[PDB]
């Protein structure tokens, strides 16, 4: 069982209809759907840094795909295919069975094909997935575009995964191990959201990228943050730290005019949406709690920080 | 200095006019050229396995791009853009300056844009580049197209990089550190070559992928293998070993009819071309030396083998 048999045994299932050439050649081939731009991203997962060392192989495979689909969704785009680059310290059939099952379970959930990649030996388990999607030309939702008066919104709940990481064994570890990329919501926000980012590093810092790109600020209402009932019972200063600086949420944070927010609520969405503040002219991120200014020092996840 | 400053300092030179959305958002955007297919590949380099630990950062950056442009060329396609996923143990400005210089030197040599990527901390230096190209729809040169009677050809020289690795300091180390992706030759072989692969693992093993995909065999003439004058002066047995199983060549091995070969030889090419054998009906790779069968056992590079 060497490199090429590993690819054949675990990573070479047939794709959905729309792949001109999948695994088996030097590159993969995709015939573009008409009137669409290619949307492309890549994110790396390092064992022990992006997931606890004892994470199940299935959850490693799932999250390796999910975090990349999240960046496709963050543009308003529809995901199509992925490449899988994996560096393995050892060949372990049971690990490979579960990891590949996790890859395919995530791909199949969101209609994505695995069309290529690379397999290497390395001293440390490292995974880089490239995701490819398509969007109607010119309709991508950028990190720029937020305007004064726009609502700030976030999907789902924030802080779950960060609580789960420090409370391994708690049910909220499911949000650490199995984030849900908000694929359909991202598509439903095309033409409604004025800006958008996915929350991989922490709501405050990721919103900050929108604020900097859009040259605006924001005031967030801390008691509106959508946190789990478990986090509603912990002291508020640490509740805010999980919610705003925890990261690993893979929810969508977006801005939207009040008028377009009304339109969005009229849709049938597969995740909840919460308005948590609004965009303002002054170029600072500030916080308010129960009607008063709430000074808060927050730092999201950043490598080498 | 931390993650986001690193990206801005080293990996964020002004984006191509030909890129709809470059670095700065959750994904990159590309507007497809009309009547062309997307060609996409990704290859990982692990420090100490894909290059000597002491390899200069500039050479590491160059080769990270080059090996991926090679897989675009192996399809007959024109390279367009890359993503860069790098995992670093430490922040070293002198290393990052050289490495990013090598990334951009290779991109600029071949007209390619760096449009996105990912930056992580990890315990071991690991790089995965994704390359994107475009090709006239339907015209990709596949590993499965070889036909009985086709010539087997290879560009440049084979065995240089493998000798270089075993003789660090020798001028042939430059073929290990700075392989040349054969981009223009790949484009010139669109519509002429019946099959093609780039020689990353070893000519015999990589030719073997074509033979299996095409359900054919090949007979190669050992004294026609294009090797460096340095290898012409070493013992024959080791010469064949370097040439046929050395790997790291990043030359193009292709099959072509005699008639299309004559057309190819009338073109202005930036690399030499050698006919080294021919495709036969029996599904075996055999070798001939001085007009007699030459039994030979070689194995190319394969992880975990
Ligand atoms: N883990 C993986 N998952 C899915 N596809 C893969 C994976 N590893 C490799 N592939 C595909 O399997 C085929 C063979 O891969 P590979 O041997 O890496 O090709 P190559 O890049 O041309 N050679 P090399 O440069 O030596 O790695 C290609 O079509 C790859 O895209
Ligand atoms: N080494 C790199 N080379 C080129 N572009 C890069 C590199 N690292 C990151 N980028 C780009 O820089 C921007 C910020 O990257 P990044 O923070 O990784 O985005 P993200 O994936 O949305 N967040 P995260 O999931 O936390 O990594 C994106 O446009 C990336 O494509
Ligand atoms: C063992 C362990 N320690 C810490 C974390 C938290 N974590 C790791 S990377 C990251 C941001 C996204 O990464 P990137 O920016 O590299 O895409 C976060 C919040 C974890 N999940 N597991
Ligand atoms: C230090 C050192 N040891 C060995 C080699 C040789 N080598 C490494 S990977 C590979 C095949 C291509 O890799 P992959 O199949 O992963 O793309 C070859 C020929 C080297 N260059 N440096
Ligand atoms: K490849
Ligand atoms: K490989
Ligand atoms: K976005
Ligand atoms: K990304
Ligand atoms: K990152
Ligand atoms: K090919
Ligand atoms: Mg190849
Ligand atoms: Mg991401
Ligand atoms: Mg490869
Ligand atoms: Mg991050
Ligand atoms: Mg993102
Ligand atoms: Mg390759
Ligand atoms: Mg990233
Ligand atoms: Mg190989």
Residue numbers in the entry:
A (entry chain A), B (entry chain B): 1 to 305
Excerpt from the publication:
Thiamine pyrophosphate (TPP) is the biologically active form of vitamin B1 (thiamine) and is essential for all living organisms. The same study also identified genes essential for growth on nutrient agar using high-density transposon mutagenesis, and found thiamine monophosphate kinase (ThiL) to be essential.
Crystals grown in the presence of 5 mM AMPPNP/TMP/MgCl2 had many growth defects. Hence, co-crystals of AbThiL with 5 mM AMPPNP/MgCl2 from an optimization screen based on MCSG1 G4 (19% w/v PEG 3350, 200 mM K/Na-tartrate, 100 mM HEPES/NaOH pH 7.5) were soaked overnight with 5 mM AMPPNP/TMP/MgCl2. Crystals were harvested in two steps with reservoir with 20% v/v EG, 5 mM AMPPNP/TMP/MgCl2 added as the cryo protectant. For the AMPPNP/TMP structure an anomalous signal could be detected for the potassium site, despite the weaker anomalous signal at shorter wavelength. For this structure, potassium was part of the crystallization condition. One metal that is in the center of the reaction is consistently magnesium: In the substrate complex a magnesium ion complexes both the scissile phosphoester bond in ATP, γ-phosphate and β-phosphate, and also the uncleaved β-phosphate and α-phosphate. Similarly, in the AbThiL substrate complex (AMPPNP/TMP), the α-phosphate group of TMP is already positioned for an in-line attack on the non-hydrolyzable γ-phosphate group of AMPPNP. In addition, we observed that the product complex (ADP/TPP) has a very similar conformation as the substrate complex. A superposition of the product complex and the substrate complex of AbThiL highlighs that the α-phosphate of TMP/TPP, and the α-phosphate and the β-phosphate groups of AMPPNP/ADP virtually do not move.
